[PDB]
Amino acid sequence: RLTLTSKETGEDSAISFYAGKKDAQGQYQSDPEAENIFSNLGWELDKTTQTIDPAKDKKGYGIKDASLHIQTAQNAEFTLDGIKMFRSSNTVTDLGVGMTLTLNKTGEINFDVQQDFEGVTKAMQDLVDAYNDLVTNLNAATDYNSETGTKGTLQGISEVNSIRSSILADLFDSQVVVMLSMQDFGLSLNDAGTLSFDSSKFEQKVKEDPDSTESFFSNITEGKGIFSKLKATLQEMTGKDGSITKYDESLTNDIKSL
């Protein structure tokens, strides 16, 4: 048996397989009885009588020929907050702004959109780790070693001490109410290299009020937020006209003259 189905879904996709010899709009033939198709493959469920005239628009007539219709095209039926909603396909892309609904079966569902802010923990962890490693490297650069092999290698260079102190300040820095200090959200600002990130306190205080936190941390770019000051300070340091380049250029010219 020949199976004939619509590529699309929805009642509008109804198909009528009509034996008319272009009776529809090529030229009116008044439904000629082409033997084979009219006798085996006409597809208007029970139409030998001219119920649907082959008009110009929606020309979907056919024949009673063979079968009983198997599966009827349907429009998906939704109920959003008591509002009856219907679409052509199971895929609803216009439910809301930036939302897409896909249908699997019928029933009742209760979705809830929450803000996903889990990445903040990873952010703080990465920041504290990088700072710990950097300050460890700096100390090791200007650590006094009783072995005296590297006792104050770069000692006398104010760059390292200025950097360490300035980042410690900007981290310990805050604004008046708004965080009083980074330790407000579990960021346990300990001694240099011993900083720890208390995930519990941060997560708790953010889940309690994510709006104040988001505001104070979006002030970062007025009352510029916390990490904005770091973005400025580290920029001045690592800048092409920054102090790092000053010491570097001095040492680079020294070897030329030498």
Binding site: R1, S13, Q74, E77, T79, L103, G107
Partner: protein, 51 residues
């Protein structure tokens, strides 16, 4: 629950909300299976003279 009758995907930036959704019927397509049961795919109706 175990089997989500419908799946809602949300992009970034959308405001927070909750949706009370109920589904009652799936979208379908129209199916036609010929009742004329031929025992040969090469069945030729030679009496269809002309076009």
């Amino acid at each position: 629950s175990d089997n989500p009758p419908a799946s809602l995907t949300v992009n970034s930036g959308v405001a927070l909300q909750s949706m009370n959704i109920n589904v009652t019927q799936l979208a379908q397509k129209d199916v036609y299976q010929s009742k004329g049961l031929a025992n040969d795919s090469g069945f030729v109706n030679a009496n269809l003279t002309g076009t």
